[PDB]
Amino acid sequence: SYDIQAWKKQCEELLNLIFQCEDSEPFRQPVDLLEYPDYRDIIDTPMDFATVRETLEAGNYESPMELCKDVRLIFSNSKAYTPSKRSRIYSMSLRLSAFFEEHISSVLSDYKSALRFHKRN
Ligand SMILES: O=C(Nc1ccccc1F)N1CCN(C(=O)c2ccco2)CC1
């Protein structure tokens, strides 16, 4: 299964599934500072799923590893901002992270295999 470009549509479909998840709603738009006034004192690099989708659609990811790094930043930001490990929004982040990781693993494996096959000679 050695298509070097296949990851892009696979990531578009996975983002569609993430947008259908109720657990993604807090992460679909850049955080609002008017509600959470201390946010940029704690978080150096904001990230959200709409920014990920736009970056993919603009053709500004070269690999699914780069997309995976930005999605993992959404989750590390939520862990860095939570006052409690028993927070509603952090709790939604942990379920959504488990879902993401379960689905991205084959995308990454297939891409890396395709690359290796391209370099085989
Ligand atoms: O406001 C947020 N998102 C949001 C944006 C627009 C419309 C509606 C929304 F919900 N947030 C709150 C801050 N975040 C946290 O990860 C967190 C962990 C513990 C408490 O917050 C990120 C998501």
UniProtKB/Swiss-Prot annotation:
Q: Which residues form the Bromo domain?
A: 2-107
**Coiled coil regions in record:** none
Subcellular localization is given as:
Nucleus
Q: What does this protein do?
A: Probable regulator of the insulin and insulin-like growth factor signaling pathways. Stimulates cell proliferation through regulation of cyclin transcription and has an anti-apoptotic activity through AKT1 phosphorylation and activation. Plays a role in the regulation of cell morphology and cytoskeletal organization.
Task: Provide the disease association from the record.
Answer: Chung-Jansen syndrome: An autosomal dominant disorder characterized by developmental delay, intellectual disability, autistic features, anxiety, hypotonia, obesity, and dysmorphic features.
Q: What is the annotated quaternary arrangement, including any partners?
A: Interacts with IRS1 and IRS2. Interacts (via bromo domain) with acetylated lysine residues on histone H1.4, histone H3 and H4 (in vitro).
Q: What is this protein called?
A: PH-interacting protein
Species assigned in the record: Homo sapiens (Human)
Q: Which gene underlies this protein?
A: PHIP
Q: Which residues of the full protein are shown?
A: 1315 to 1435 of 1821
